[PDB]
Scaffold this active site. Sequence first.
Site, PDB file in Angstrom:
ATOM      1  N   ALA A 184       0.823  -1.201   0.000  1.00 28.29           N
ATOM      2  CA  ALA A 184       0.000   0.000   0.000  1.00 28.29           C
ATOM      3  C   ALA A 184       0.849   1.239   0.000  1.00 28.29           C
ATOM      4  CB  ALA A 184      -0.937   0.017   1.177  1.00 28.29           C
ATOM      5  N   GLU A 196      -4.931  -5.027  -9.015  1.00 25.79           N
ATOM      6  CA  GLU A 196      -5.224  -4.635 -10.380  1.00 25.79           C
ATOM      7  C   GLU A 196      -4.276  -5.345 -11.319  1.00 25.79           C
ATOM      8  OE1 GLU A 196      -5.625  -0.119 -10.876  1.00 25.79           O
ATOM      9  OE2 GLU A 196      -5.551  -0.553  -8.694  1.00 25.79           O
ATOM     10  N   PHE A 212      -3.642 -14.337  -0.582  1.00 22.83           N
ATOM     11  CA  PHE A 212      -2.927 -13.790   0.585  1.00 22.83           C
ATOM     12  C   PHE A 212      -2.534 -12.320   0.412  1.00 22.83           C
ATOM     13  CE2 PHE A 212      -0.039 -16.031  -2.169  1.00 22.83           C
ATOM     14  CZ  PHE A 212       0.933 -15.086  -2.417  1.00 22.83           C
ATOM     15  N   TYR A 262       2.032  -5.153 -11.594  1.00 18.01           N
ATOM     16  CA  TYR A 262       3.259  -5.880 -11.276  1.00 18.01           C
ATOM     17  C   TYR A 262       4.037  -6.478 -12.459  1.00 18.01           C
ATOM     18  CZ  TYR A 262       1.600  -5.146  -6.511  1.00 18.01           C
ATOM     19  OH  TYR A 262       1.173  -4.572  -5.335  1.00 18.01           O
ATOM     20  N   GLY A 283       6.832   7.037  -6.941  1.00 14.22           N
ATOM     21  CA  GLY A 283       7.780   5.942  -6.972  1.00 14.22           C
ATOM     22  C   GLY A 283       7.895   5.092  -5.718  1.00 14.22           C
TER      23      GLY A 283
HETATM   24  C1  LIG Z   1      -2.943  -7.499  -1.393  1.00  6.18           C
HETATM   25  C2  LIG Z   1      -1.750  -6.738  -1.980  1.00  6.18           C
HETATM   26  O1  LIG Z   1      -1.016  -6.139  -1.189  1.00  6.18           O
HETATM   27  S1  LIG Z   1      -1.380  -6.699  -3.790  1.00  6.18           S
HETATM   28  C3  LIG Z   1      -2.167  -5.345  -4.637  1.00  6.18           C
HETATM   29  C4  LIG Z   1      -1.577  -3.903  -4.579  1.00  6.18           C
HETATM   30  N1  LIG Z   1      -1.964  -2.999  -3.464  1.00  6.18           N
HETATM   31  C5  LIG Z   1      -2.793  -1.824  -3.677  1.00  6.18           C
HETATM   32  O2  LIG Z   1      -3.183  -1.574  -4.795  1.00  6.18           O
HETATM   33  C6  LIG Z   1      -3.193  -0.928  -2.545  1.00  6.18           C
HETATM   34  C7  LIG Z   1      -4.046   0.285  -2.936  1.00  6.18           C
HETATM   35  N2  LIG Z   1      -3.449   0.965  -4.031  1.00  6.18           N
HETATM   36  C8  LIG Z   1      -2.120   1.482  -3.808  1.00  6.18           C
HETATM   37  O3  LIG Z   1      -1.613   1.338  -2.688  1.00  6.18           O
HETATM   38  C9  LIG Z   1      -1.264   2.228  -4.906  1.00  6.18           C
HETATM   39  O4  LIG Z   1      -2.004   2.715  -5.946  1.00  6.18           O
HETATM   40  C10 LIG Z   1      -0.177   1.316  -5.453  1.00  6.18           C
HETATM   41  C11 LIG Z   1       0.659   0.682  -4.314  1.00  6.18           C
HETATM   42  C12 LIG Z   1      -0.772   0.191  -6.284  1.00  6.18           C
HETATM   43  C13 LIG Z   1       0.698   2.183  -6.365  1.00  6.18           C
HETATM   44  O5  LIG Z   1       1.933   2.614  -5.871  1.00  6.18           O
HETATM   45  P1  LIG Z   1       2.470   4.007  -6.246  1.00  6.18           P
HETATM   46  O6  LIG Z   1       3.656   4.319  -5.354  1.00  6.18           O
HETATM   47  O7  LIG Z   1       1.405   5.084  -6.087  1.00  6.18           O
HETATM   48  O8  LIG Z   1       2.981   3.948  -7.756  1.00  6.18           O
HETATM   49  P2  LIG Z   1       4.522   4.003  -8.144  1.00  6.18           P
HETATM   50  O9  LIG Z   1       4.811   5.434  -8.533  1.00  6.18           O
HETATM   51  O10 LIG Z   1       5.386   3.534  -6.994  1.00  6.18           O
HETATM   52  O11 LIG Z   1       4.697   3.022  -9.427  1.00  6.18           O
HETATM   53  C14 LIG Z   1       5.480   3.247 -10.564  1.00  6.18           C
HETATM   54  C15 LIG Z   1       4.960   2.814 -11.850  1.00  6.18           C
HETATM   55  O12 LIG Z   1       3.952   1.814 -11.622  1.00  6.18           O
HETATM   56  C16 LIG Z   1       2.747   2.308 -12.123  1.00  6.18           C
HETATM   57  N3  LIG Z   1       1.463   2.075 -11.347  1.00  6.18           N
HETATM   58  C17 LIG Z   1       1.166   2.328 -10.056  1.00  6.18           C
HETATM   59  N4  LIG Z   1      -0.120   1.974  -9.838  1.00  6.18           N
HETATM   60  C18 LIG Z   1      -0.640   1.505 -11.006  1.00  6.18           C
HETATM   61  C19 LIG Z   1      -1.906   1.002 -11.404  1.00  6.18           C
HETATM   62  N5  LIG Z   1      -2.994   0.914 -10.440  1.00  6.18           N
HETATM   63  N6  LIG Z   1      -2.099   0.603 -12.686  1.00  6.18           N
HETATM   64  C20 LIG Z   1      -1.099   0.691 -13.599  1.00  6.18           C
HETATM   65  N7  LIG Z   1       0.115   1.170 -13.262  1.00  6.18           N
HETATM   66  C21 LIG Z   1       0.369   1.575 -11.980  1.00  6.18           C
HETATM   67  C22 LIG Z   1       2.920   3.758 -12.332  1.00  6.18           C
HETATM   68  O13 LIG Z   1       2.292   4.125 -13.506  1.00  6.18           O
HETATM   69  C23 LIG Z   1       4.330   3.961 -12.498  1.00  6.18           C
HETATM   70  O14 LIG Z   1       4.488   4.012 -13.870  1.00  6.18           O
HETATM   71  P3  LIG Z   1       5.783   4.534 -14.558  1.00  6.18           P
HETATM   72  O15 LIG Z   1       6.722   3.344 -14.639  1.00  6.18           O
HETATM   73  O16 LIG Z   1       5.500   5.053 -15.962  1.00  6.18           O
HETATM   74  O17 LIG Z   1       6.394   5.634 -13.718  1.00  6.18           O
END
Ligand SMILES: CC(=O)SCCNC(=O)CCNC(=O)[C@H](O)C(C)(C)COP(=O)(O)OP(=O)(O)OC[C@H]1O[C@@H](n2cnc3c(N)ncnc32)[C@H](O)[C@@H]1OP(=O)(O)O
Lengths: 396, 396, 396, 396
Positions: free
Chosen positions: C85, C121, C396, C125, C94
Amino acid sequence: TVTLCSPTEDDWPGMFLLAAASFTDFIGPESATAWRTLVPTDGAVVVRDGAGPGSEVVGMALYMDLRLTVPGEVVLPTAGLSFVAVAPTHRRRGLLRAMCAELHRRIADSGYPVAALHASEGGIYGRFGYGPATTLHELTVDRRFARFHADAPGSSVRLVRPTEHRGEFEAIYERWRQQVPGGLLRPQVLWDELLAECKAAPGGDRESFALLHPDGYALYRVDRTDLKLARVSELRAVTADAHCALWRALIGLDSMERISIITHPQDPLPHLLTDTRLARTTWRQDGLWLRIMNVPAALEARGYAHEVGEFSTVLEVSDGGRFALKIGDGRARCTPTDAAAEIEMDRDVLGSLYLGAHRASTLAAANRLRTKDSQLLRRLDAAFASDVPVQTAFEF
Amino acid sequence: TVTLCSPTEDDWPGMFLLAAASFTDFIGPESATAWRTLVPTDGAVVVRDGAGPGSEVVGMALYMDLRLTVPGEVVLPTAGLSFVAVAPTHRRRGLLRAMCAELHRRIADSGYPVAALHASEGGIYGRFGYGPATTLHELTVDRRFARFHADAPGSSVRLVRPTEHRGEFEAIYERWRQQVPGGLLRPQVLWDELLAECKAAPGGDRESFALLHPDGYALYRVDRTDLKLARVSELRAVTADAHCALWRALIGLDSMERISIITHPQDPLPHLLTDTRLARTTWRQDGLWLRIMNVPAALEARGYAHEVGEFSTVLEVSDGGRFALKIGDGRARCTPTDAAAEIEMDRDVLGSLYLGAHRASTLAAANRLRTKDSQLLRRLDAAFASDVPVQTAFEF
Amino acid sequence: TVTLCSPTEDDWPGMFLLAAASFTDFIGPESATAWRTLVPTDGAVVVRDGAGPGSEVVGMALYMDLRLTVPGEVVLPTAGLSFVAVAPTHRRRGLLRAMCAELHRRIADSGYPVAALHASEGGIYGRFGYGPATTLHELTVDRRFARFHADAPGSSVRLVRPTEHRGEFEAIYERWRQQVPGGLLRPQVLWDELLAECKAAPGGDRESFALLHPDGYALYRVDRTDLKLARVSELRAVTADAHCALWRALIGLDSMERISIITHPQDPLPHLLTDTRLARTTWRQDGLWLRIMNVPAALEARGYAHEVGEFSTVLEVSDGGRFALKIGDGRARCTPTDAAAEIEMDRDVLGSLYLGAHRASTLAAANRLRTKDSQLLRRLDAAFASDVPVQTAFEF
Amino acid sequence: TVTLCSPTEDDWPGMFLLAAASFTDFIGPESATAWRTLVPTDGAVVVRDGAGPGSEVVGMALYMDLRLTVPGEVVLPTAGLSFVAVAPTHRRRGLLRAMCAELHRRIADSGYPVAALHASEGGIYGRFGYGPATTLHELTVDRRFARFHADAPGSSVRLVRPTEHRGEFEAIYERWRQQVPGGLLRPQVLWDELLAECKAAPGGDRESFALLHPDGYALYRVDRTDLKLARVSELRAVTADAHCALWRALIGLDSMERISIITHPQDPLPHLLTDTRLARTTWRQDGLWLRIMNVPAALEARGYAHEVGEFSTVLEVSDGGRFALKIGDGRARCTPTDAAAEIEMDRDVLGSLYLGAHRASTLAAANRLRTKDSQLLRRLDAAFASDVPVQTAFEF
Ligand SMILES: CC(=O)SCCNC(=O)CCNC(=O)[C@H](O)C(C)(C)COP(=O)(O)OP(=O)(O)OC[C@H]1O[C@@H](n2cnc3c(N)ncnc32)[C@H](O)[C@@H]1OP(=O)(O)O
Ligand SMILES: CC(=O)SCCNC(=O)CCNC(=O)[C@H](O)C(C)(C)COP(=O)(O)OP(=O)(O)OC[C@H]1O[C@@H](n2cnc3c(N)ncnc32)[C@H](O)[C@@H]1OP(=O)(O)O
Ligand SMILES: CC(=O)SCCNC(=O)CCNC(=O)[C@H](O)C(C)(C)COP(=O)(O)OP(=O)(O)OC[C@H]1O[C@@H](n2cnc3c(N)ncnc32)[C@H](O)[C@@H]1OP(=O)(O)O
Ligand SMILES: CC(=O)SCCNC(=O)CCNC(=O)[C@H](O)C(C)(C)COP(=O)(O)OP(=O)(O)OC[C@H]1O[C@@H](n2cnc3c(N)ncnc32)[C@H](O)[C@@H]1OP(=O)(O)O
């Protein structure tokens, strides 16, 4: 490789194909007239994929010559962009941007002060200097609970077939569009198209019945699927009595549960009823969009509020130069200049203000128009406001 | 037969009963405090079936001492009607009308300029002199498509547990309500209520969370069933920079598919996005209603547009007297008179026009307000406008 | 400022907030058990906003010691990412990329051949080297019509209280996961959790019941709202006979209209019924994702189809080194090399093949794994298939 | 009592009544042509109520002459059953069994090795030796979020009127169906039907447009009621590049929200996208059903997987005799034997395995295919697999 030009007889089939796939509503027979009738010599452009007669048509756009009523009951000839389309095989190649820049130059040379369109989507045209300038709210009021307020004005109206009263509608519409900011002159060919759509179509819309008053009318059609809903395709009223007489009649369709209409935020319907909530708003969206082509022409063209006292300021449009604007006694003087700009704004925003549907102070709050003089804000808010609330005429 | 009078202590239980069966949001424990510490002594009246104490409680209505901000940043002591209820057994017997006559009397006597409420239905209170005074817009925004305009101001905000920042919420709130027409002083007993509500209820709402900026805040709770919808219960900001920072963070609820908020028509959110529509308007309804109890008192208290040149008219409120009203310099003088009335209206019309949420010209067009001078209409519109757009505070 | 570190005691609260605001399914008391009993020393990581103790927690991620059954019945210790998160206030800076890089450095130094997660989503990854490795098929069966085939195997089953048969389930589940690619060993803290969720929650899930069979079991519970729907949360069978026996009993829940389950693409349920269509696929989506950390270890660990003739090749992983890969007798030998690469792919593609859930030939049609020789595609197709079809264990 | 015979000229009307009342899509004019054109003399039979010319038609069924492509690019003459109907007034008397037995004898007597149909219902044809042989995945993709992966291949294709390119389409589809298991030869009379079905129909489907590439094409139309939704009628691609570039274009339909399409499980769309989930599966069901009329002819006709090593077994088809099946170098020898059966199965199971759309390991878990030898089972899975994944041609 890619060419942008005024069509020739050869591109017609290209444009016809592109137009049909691109616009769900569009059809070939109905469309042929509109273009011949409302498009100036070279107010149309196509993108050819290459060179050679028969070169595939991958983009098209054109403007119509229309007359717009701005505030103060002035009429400005207006360039109305329509049938803008890029083939799906050529998305994101700069084609839309290219086509607008070409059209804009022609409009600028033709001496149009404003351009206008209805946006398919909300995020496209702001970059090309169009700001949204009227507001459309879908209106649906349950008709079973509605009672008219004791104050409401008012049988002086007749249920009739629309095709038998075209002349009456024309007169009424012409008075109305001359009185309302947003009004557009409706040329015969569009009465034709509008009139034809009253007749029932198999697999489509039902027959439409008019409500006719000396100073207003209403065309309404029962919905295709929901047989308890009546849709008012268009309501035109020049006086408050006709507006209220028509509504008493619509409310009178006892076989209906709901009546719906596209209208403006200042529609007085809610207030004619004992329960203003009945005339509920079920949809809210932008309508007509404007691009100011010639700042001085546009600002000097429109009348302003008398109720704000004389004042002077320099308005700067991002990459459209600077302007000394003076507004007093309901008139403006706007000329280019070089004085420091007291206020600055993107071109699209000026459009959003031009008709009075948006308050400059709100846009200011969104950093879309800047200045350091809070007093100037209030003055523009006030100046640019419309005495008569803006109304949307017809989509194009 | 029946009997109208102040409730004693024996009347409490009966009222809670009536309330619970009249209002689906009611609760016995939560209310005892708000009713008790905000309702003035003998601000509460009930109707009992027959006499001899402990009679069945069949009608109830009370008011609360609250402070309302109005145009000009002036605070008016206000009486807020609430827990108005007639038992199903006694409907349409004049109980509501009698309870109103009684409380208005007490309210007039007690020195209140005007009384406001929130209406369960839309055609109950107008007859009693209340007019809808502010407007509620539900905005539903699709977070996924949102992108901020390059012009948009903007990290300065942190995701916090509400119960840990009460002080900073309260201070922020105080700043906002003293600046926004329609703002309400929030009682300490109501910070209790709000702070308590954040906690998750089994089968009920989910935990709320807050976003905190120095100059604004937001409370949001994920909806009970649509786990893709974030509902903002309250968004408070005092600067354009906070408003935007908070929205940048709301759009950052990546797990959400949409964000919803109850706000006001002049909310600049849409203009902060590259797509104006994404901030779709979904539900539209009246919020705070006003009854002007004392016409000169009220009219003189509120500030007026400076951007309207000084002028004089004669206003007649039906059943509200006749006064010579003069506006100039942002101030108004209102003095009794027997000169011919240049403009007339029902009392409710005055209340709606009081916060500036309605234009006198629109009401004129429903014949709710009438005059033979059009220039005066325009002068009112302009005069009664509000530099700061009206906002709604909290239901009660 | 932005500090990236193993969480100390001072952070716990910061995380509970970030988790609850991030995942709707989050519970503080229950989740406290898993990190504590399943996350290795420094298998967790948090981002802190700034300096000082108790700084605010604005990102989090951890990895649990995951045991994974890959094709060939070989068990590989694997790092399972969970509770990833980034706060809504810090998105797009980042942080995810930073948290990943770090956990990965930790995972590699600790020896894990591979990593796994479940993606919130689908577009996240891949860029970090995880490919979707298993498929989930949601199956809704209208049992009112379900009849078993004449060939279907088969009262050797019992209806039981889940919390009275934990051990039988652990034993059964134990045999199952050692046999099926996709199995994960389920530790004691997880069985505590599973059993805890079997009891009714007021305003939540109803009581779960279990069907118990010597070689398998099913847990299922009536759905919250739809009283005619049964949700099977878990069905594990070691034998085809167990599988059929279990479903006979589930089709026997006479007071239900539908039974739904989350299962794999090769679940033989449809072919047990005289009408295959009764097991309708009402949902299909990626499930387990794999990041190959150590290409030689992971490739040598996995079993390969015996039928395919022996062969050699050189496989390049985009910026992951080049690799000599020899497959024969259902075994692999894989060592770094500098030969020309015959086939190449982004690391995540390899992940997608690892468990047989995606064909080499399919990925190649999308140009995701690239080779100049067709024979090699088909050989990779044959080789990476799994004798036993991969199933999904628990999220998980 | 009743009678089973070939339809004479007098039965044509009755057949149109029965057909039209048993199939909601049936049209008399369009059908005339396929049956006469595609149904062999005597390929059709009816059941009559009584004797004497004029008797009422209460049962029909016929087959068409089709050419099905199977693994190895081999084209089998096949019999396609269709227009199978028993009148609601004669349901359950054995008419279908009677009509099938007659058609099958004629079908065998005429020398087809395989019959196929599309099943109106899933529990009907298995008993008659037909097994689900292909799978249809209905895929709905949200166009707005779709981004092409950096790896994806790809203006080389253009938007055209389908009826202006019959030859280009015939060509492509021809190359397609010769290469893909499941292909069908499309008769000129069916290209006729496809072209006609492209013109808009009042109250029916909207105009189809096409996307035309050197090596593939796509026919689509906007949906009848869902104006943001594009249905792809059929998609033909012979190169990966074509498949991609066509999908680059459908995604280019900006006016649309969603594209939907019917395709096969090994469609690489999802792997073309940055988010594989965007290629959502919204429906999945069996398509073409096969009955192997002649086991040897059929098993010796289709090419096998090279990447399985030569092996032998005894295959026994219940009611189908016993066979020594030997697969070497991608080819099969299948001959009469009375040796002990190493694997047994009903006729329809063999249908299901024939084109490679189902695994023997999976049908075995259902006990539909039986053997004490797992190693043998792996060898069948392997061998029956297809180099080119099977797709579905057209419904008949
Ligand atoms: C159960 C689990 O723990 S697994 C599932 C993941 N957890 C969550 O989604 C929790 C709620 N959502 C979030 O916390 C956030 O949106 C996160 C963790 C998914 C995103 O992390 P962030 O720090 O905001 O993105 P961050 O800047 O680190 O990522 C870098 C790259 O990944 C990409 N990215 C981040 N979120 C997404 C997304 N939802 N869809 C597509 N690409 C994404 C960014 O576009 C960025 O692209 P770039 O390479 O062109 O710069
Ligand atoms: C009724 C009337 O005529 S108005 C309604 C318009 N008509 C239609 O949209 C018909 C169907 N849709 C289309 O034809 C296409 O999507 C078009 C015509 C809108 C786009 O043309 P394109 O050539 O692909 O756009 P083009 O690349 O020239 O535009 C460039 C910029 O606009 C942006 N853009 C294009 N479409 C959109 C959109 N729907 N939303 C937001 N931005 C857009 C691009 O992102 C690009 O960004 P940039 O400014 O940073 O460069
Ligand atoms: C949060 C707040 O406290 S504000 C919301 C009010 N609370 C509730 O509505 C609780 C549930 N409903 C009720 O209690 C009742 O319907 C009440 C109290 C609103 C009405 O009281 P009643 O005694 O039944 O009405 P009463 O006869 O006294 O009122 C007289 C007039 O008001 C009118 N009236 C009463 N309710 C309504 C209504 N829902 N819509 C329109 N007119 C109404 C009557 O028609 C009558 O009209 P008239 O002037 O021509 O005679
Ligand atoms: C597109 C096409 O041309 S192919 C699809 C077929 N078309 C249609 O079904 C159109 C409408 N439906 C019908 O006409 C009828 O339901 C038919 C033709 C399918 C069935 O014919 P019937 O004469 O009623 O059945 P009949 O008695 O001959 O068949 C015997 C057995 O088949 C079985 N059977 C018949 N219909 C079904 C069914 N819908 N589902 C399962 N079993 C069935 C019966 O149970 C019967 O049982 P048994 O095996 O124990 O003896």
